[PDB]
Symmetry: C3
């Protein structure tokens, strides 16, 4: 059982929506420390790891820890009913139901039924969210895959298509590149469709840390409310 | 014959649009006191009564009273051509045509051809438009019908679906509930689809008066420009 | 070869988009004086003449003049990736490729492959863009053709449909009419679908000069960045 209060329903809705683009259903582990969730998309190409610490909730009361399963598609619809200034209350008792209350000008309570990484990276780059998002959109216009190239103090994203091509270079002098630590020239390619969903909802000024290796998965992480952690693991493109 | 001037074309367009969601054609009675119109939707579940007093028009000149029939679908298209700061001029002479002039940066004149409740309520509630609108949208996500429950100083709207449920409670202490007069516990259910169209265009801060009774129709009314009156009569759901 | 820099990617994207509504592919003549392009739509009803002088570019370097052909549909997609504050760089070397760089928070470079009026008008009218645009939209609601009537100090646009009609009159006293020079009463009709695309992107306060004659083509022109010239020649409706 628990009672968790989050200020800013819209923000929470956004997070869930992002997750729903890849995940249809998932189990949320609710502990005294926070809420965590891990799952893979249907194609088993993306792994998503979310952690929301109790510190981002205006009230976090967990009587006894518990894991709950929910349909994200159904969950998002309800959460999208909340506004930016609305407070969201998540409550769970004995029954297999989740009580979702949107409190604003009035109190609206929904009742929804509940259902039942150690990689040797050789490159780490920290870029601004705006840059990452633009790069992914540019690439989608030319190809279905985007190549990541990381060299000493240099980060490049390229996409090659039938007859078109796009390239985004970045150096320490650039405002988009905050940090870069490369042990050796690193390159690999990933599916643009996946990255599109991943960079969905991503802020403009938020810092995104990307780690990857030659022909190996990419790890992407950024924070929500500075404390919440959203980590993605994306397999390379065959 | 007449010449009626309304300041704010967009506002008028909005009113007509709302009406067009339920009504396809209707007769407008134009008298020296104002413009009135009454009609039922195709399913005969909703009755709409509109009254626009001469006081909301910047100029209201009626030479001789007259009833005119018009296709609301055609009417709305033209009215939607007007902006928020545009002045609307409605003129009618001898012929079976309505002259609609949108006056803004230029004068644009359209010519369109013309075509040819005593209930024993036991509950009256006055709520803010924002509350009513949110409640209807919440409910549409779970069911096709919404239950209205009114008790002494307590108003509740519930919707029960396959496995989901939504509930919105309201008390005098709530900002959404402005007034409540109940003679005895009153309950009934109505179709959400109808209420959706009815609460369409409804303001956020405007006061809506709802009157109903056990398993009987609901009367809903609110004002336009504080003087204009829009009254709906909605049959209970079978 | 050349290197042309334009401040405000979005603005350029808009111009190209407008052109793409009528033209699918076209050759741009790049000279030391500026960039010009002339082409006809598929139905051969509209001729478009564009001239962008070097003065509207923040940097205009043309080593050797050159004509380049491009698919506007492909071009617009890429240009739409630019924001209002982005700088656009167009570069061409030896190969049959156009290098398009959007420079903002980061530098994104696209590589796209390159592919290979003396009328006796009797009426000239200068009207505000807002008026022209509203008039075209009003007319599209009633007919597929709009009639232009120009008399001494009087300009009228009419559209007659099955049973509806629209009319927009303009005099020197009107704010929408800036100037009018008529040698004799002039009238002709044009296709609304074409005018819709032509008035696409057209500003609200920009001055549009229209010249036409009895049952003859209409010439429409307005400026982009006060220096750029966009001229349309529209054949009368049969």
């Amino acid at each position: 059982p628990f009672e968790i209060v989050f200020e800013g329903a819209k923000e929470f809705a956004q997070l869930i929506d992002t997750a729903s683009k890849l995940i249809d259903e998932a189990a949320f582990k609710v502990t005294e420390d926070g809420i965590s969730m891990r799952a893979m998309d249907p194609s088993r190409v993306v792994l998503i790891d979310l952690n929301l610490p109790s510190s981002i909730f205006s009230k976090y009361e967990v009587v006894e820890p518990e894991t709950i399963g929910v349909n994200l598609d159904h969950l998002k619809k309800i959460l999208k009913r909340g506004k930016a200034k609305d407070t969201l209350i998540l409550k769970k008792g004995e029954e297999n139901f989740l009580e979702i209350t949107i409190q604003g000008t009035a109190t609206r309570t929904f009742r929804v039924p509940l259902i039942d990484p150690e990689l040797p990276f050789t490159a780490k780059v920290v870029v601004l969210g705006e840059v990452l998002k633009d790069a992914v959109k540019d690439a989608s216009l030319v190809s279905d895959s985007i190549k990541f190239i990381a060299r000493e103090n240099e980060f490049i994203m390229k996409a090659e298509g039938e007859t078109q091509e796009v390239e985004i270079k970045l150096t320490l002098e650039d405002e988009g590149l905050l940090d870069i630590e490369v042990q050796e020239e690193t390159k690999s390619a990933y599916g643009v469709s996946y990255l599109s969903d991943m960079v969905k909802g991503l802020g403009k000024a938020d810092e995104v840390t990307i780690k990857f290796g030659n022909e190996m998965p990419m790890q992407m992480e950024y924070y929500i409310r500075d404390e919440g952690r959203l980590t993605f693991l994306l397999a390379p493109r065959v």
